[model samples]
Target: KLMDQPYSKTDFLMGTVVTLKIYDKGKEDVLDKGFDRIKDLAAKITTSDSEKTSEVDKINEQAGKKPVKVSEDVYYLIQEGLKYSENSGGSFDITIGPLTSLWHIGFSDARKPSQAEIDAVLPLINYKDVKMNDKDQTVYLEKEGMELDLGAIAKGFITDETLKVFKENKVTTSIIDLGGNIYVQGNNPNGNKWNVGIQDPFSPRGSVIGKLPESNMSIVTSGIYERYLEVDGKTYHHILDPKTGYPFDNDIAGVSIVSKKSIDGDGLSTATFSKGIKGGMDYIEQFEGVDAIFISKEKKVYETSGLKGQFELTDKDFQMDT
Candidate 1:
């Protein structure tokens, strides 16, 4: 049976539009509470918010000094972020803050940094330099100029936490959109599988190369088209390679990961760009319960073994590579 209208709320946090919809109407003020949760999380995680220095800023401010004790929220998320760094062989690292600030891609003043400037900060881009004391719940960055930018994963982590809040309030079905990172709770409102569009890399928003069925999972895409800096007719995207201190120069236009955990989608989507199309497909196949769709610049679509027969190609211009 179909459910009643969902209680919806929207707010801007973590530099993106966050939307929440809950089907359980009994909780009248639940949307407000949900927005509040996002606000609090953003206050701690966002580096762009200069009005109040976030916990991440505090850690950056104290870099090379004494370890700063932090809430379990920041402590655990840092540890969790390190796991992605380790798993991806440093491809997905939170320690790319120094590099991000230098380029400032996605910001109004984004520009291409010179090679000398890039080389200077490359030494500070190692995730291994970030130290965490599980016993004391403290974090320290060994380098003074180094910073932590959780742009790659914090939104997903926040989404998971918000879902916890919803479930505690007896929210059975819902939809969450944290910009391009989306999660679906339970089932579709129409009483069928939720069909979500996989964004077309070459086209405008709402254009899709395919549609995916999602239930109780997150679908996240990390694409060069999301944000870029064009210099001398060359495009430099925001997703930087920690090793080279430059945008990931690959044939892949975008990589979308669908997984039970939103955090997984967050890290894997960015990591997949570094892996390229073939390596990304292989990487996605290695993990159980994780499926991916790789959209390449050549208009060829490649999916992991898990996504076979499940992902429907809606755009006639794109062809599945099989």
Candidate 2:
């Protein structure tokens, strides 16, 4: 008999909370393996400030020196990030490391950076500085002081890997959430679609202004609501503009991407948000198998035509304006 209540395990990994819930009665042990997979992937990719060693750091350490060869996973993930960087025209740059390291927006060292500091790192934030060798599987950051910071998409990759572990173990009906990157497969134990909440940017954490009925898809959100540095009466968000050397400011308060893969959703969330509401809707629509939700600062919610009528607003303060 199937379990009406899901067997859930929550752990702190990759600097944030990770939860895995499996509804299959006999397959609860798969949760252990999934968590292990997430841990291993996190250790492999992250170049966090607290790091003994990371494959990504190897590349960063050797910046402007030489290309560093990496494992299949590191190579593939970095390679994929670079593609999105190019596709988004530097809006989602993986090579924005110098600037990111300087800002440290959400970290304990979070502070406002001076204009002189931002000027030095701006040129180092170019994605073109990164070079990849498919033949030998090496990643190179050409310029000195350049770094490959994959924080934006590493959680998505980790979540996706956890999903593969569940699939290999034949575990059906599960929810994988690594920080805010989420993926839901099959139906709920109650035999209904998953209602994943789109967070309210104006309110406290976990407050949902809208909800999406999802099945076998990934949901990822990006916004200034969380993770910012407030100093001297100014608030700076974590989502930095590669060109501007600061947070991306526009009409968008938050944007969510629904796609087949968490990594794709992560990329599109930033890519679309940078375009603002109207252009963001058109940007996400150009891709097949992807839908988006844009929340404006004016308390309006915009949905790509693909998600029209499907994504419902739960709060009266918000409207389905688009």
Candidate 3:
């Protein structure tokens, strides 16, 4: 659907995906300008400088303080994210930096840290200590040296914002496949639903468990699969459990969240992955407009009651039910 053979590219910091499809009449310049704007927005939001009121920078600086005023849009998004964290009871906290940073599972030198090391960091980690003031749009963190990592939600939000820009330009039908999330705008050019594959967490790249239909929505997956490092003959995954300061060990290999918004799916999937199957299912059930598919620890597959007829199942010997 490219105006001139729609080309795609990636931005590293936000781990973003950009696809340009303009009017097929010498609109290359328009496409370039579109991407430039998208990049600018993504950069601004992910930056963490206190002097900068960019979404991320504001939140980052206030990680352990009180709400610092921000735009309504950014405040609301962070507000929604915190609601999920509160509901999940710390499982999906934006305040999990202390533990996550200590582990560094995806780095080449990943290794198990001592219990004291874990205990030392846990004090600095607690979502309850993270505060937000909606009326004034200020966020605050109660402690010092505390950090906020939005790796779980920011990229998806970036994709969602990028889509908004594209929509404003009157360009419909686009697909953004960030490694952690997928934000699709409109159906395919031919009017067919956009189809995207869910990568198998335990298998090779491109080895998918199934394909899902997408239309102006987002799909985000969280698992032990994406980033990991081997040490002492053991593999440590990136999905950390703040309570234990270790990678999550539960009956869920991965969790895929499908929602009308990328930011929602992205943040929810991460929080759900840390919640485990039973808790995750229960957590998602209370929320409206969202559905989930789970890959259990035993390699079992499960889908929510809402997704039964809507999502397809693949992979031999995998059991799926409500």
Candidate 4:
């Protein structure tokens, strides 16, 4: 017999609350093991922490001095991040720490940065400056003050690894939410399609723009609404443009990607946002095993050909893009 209720646990990881639920009858301890793995990985990848510094922090600390060898996990993750950086034409760079700190969005000291401040950091924002030594698994940044931040894709990679831990433990049916990144394993417990809500970018909280009915897939959303800085009368989102050293000024409000791998969805979400509406659709369509839902600034919703019938718009305030 299958477990009737899911055993769940919620804890802080990667600077956000992560919840892991598994239908494992009385074996709730499996969730603890999975959570531990996630926490361990988080520590290794984090740029800074109160308790101790991470491997990535050490690498950053040695920037411009010499190449620092990292663990296999961190090395591969950085390599994967560079791939997305290349694919997006350098729009989605992991080495964007300088720009992120300058604006400080989503932090207590968040504020609009002056052009001079942005310009000073622009030279340190290039992904090309990151050099990797595959033989020794070392990472090197060409200049001082350059930093690598894997916040955008690290959560997804961790979630994927957590899922693997569950599978190894024989917990087939499960769901994990790392902040906004969600992964529904196997099928819905009730034997119906999982209905995942699409966040309404303009709403305060717990509002939905629509619902996506799918199974055994990863759902991730990236949006200007996620983080931002409000100054005087203007609002600046956290999604920065690598070329301009400023927030991405585009027509997209948010983009959700459904894919087999959460990492792909993660990289593609920000990449698609950088492409805007028209070009975004074109870029997403070129890739297989990936579907996207795009919400425009005009309160218009657009989706890829693959998500035609699977995605349903529930809110009346928004119109579907024809």
- Give the C-alpha miss distance for residue 134 in model 3, angstroms: 6.2
Per-residue C-alpha lDDT of model 2 across residues 157-202, encoded as one tens digit per residue: 8878888888898887889987678899888778789999898887
List model 3 lDDT by residue over 64-98, tens digit each: 55557666655666666677677665667777766
Over the stretch 1-322, how does candidate 1's per-residue lDDT look in tens digits?
2256877887776567778888875775878877888888877887787664799989988999989988888887889888999889578889989999899998888999999999999888888899898889999999789899988888889888888888788888888888888888888777777888899977655578888987899998777777788899999988888889999888899778899888888877767778789987888888899998888899899878877878899889988886
Error of 1 at 173 (Å): 0.5
Error of 4 at 180 (Å): 1.5
Give all candidates' CA lDDT scores.
0.84, 0.85, 0.69, 0.84
On lDDT, the leading prediction is 2
Lowest summed-lDDT stretch of 10 residues in model 4? 46-55
Clashing pairs in 1: none
Model 2, global lDDT: 0.85
| TM match of model 2 to true structure | 0.96
Ranking 1 against 2 by TM-score, winner = 2
Query: Candidate 4, residues 1-322: lDDT per residue as tens digits?
Result: 3575789898975457788988767668998899888988999998646454888887778879999989888998899999999889568998898888778787778888889988888888888899999888899998899988888888889889888888888887888888768898877777887788888888653478888987889988777777778899788887788779888778898888889989888887777888888889889999998988889999999889999867788899999965
Pick the winner on TM-score between candidates 3 and 4.
4
- Listed per candidate, the RMSD to the true structure in angstroms reads 1.6, 1.4, 3.8, 1.6
The lDDT-based order of candidates, best leading, equals 2, 1, 4, 3
Per-model TM-score on C-alpha atoms: 0.95, 0.96, 0.81, 0.95
- Which is the better candidate, 1 or 3, if ranked by TM-score? 1
Backbone atom clashes (below 3 Å) for every candidate: 0, 0, 13, 0
Q: Which regions of candidate 3 deviate over 4 angstroms?
A: 1-7, 10-38, 41-77, 131-138, 317-322
Whose TM-score is greatest here?
Answer: 2
Model 3 TM-score, all chains together: 0.81
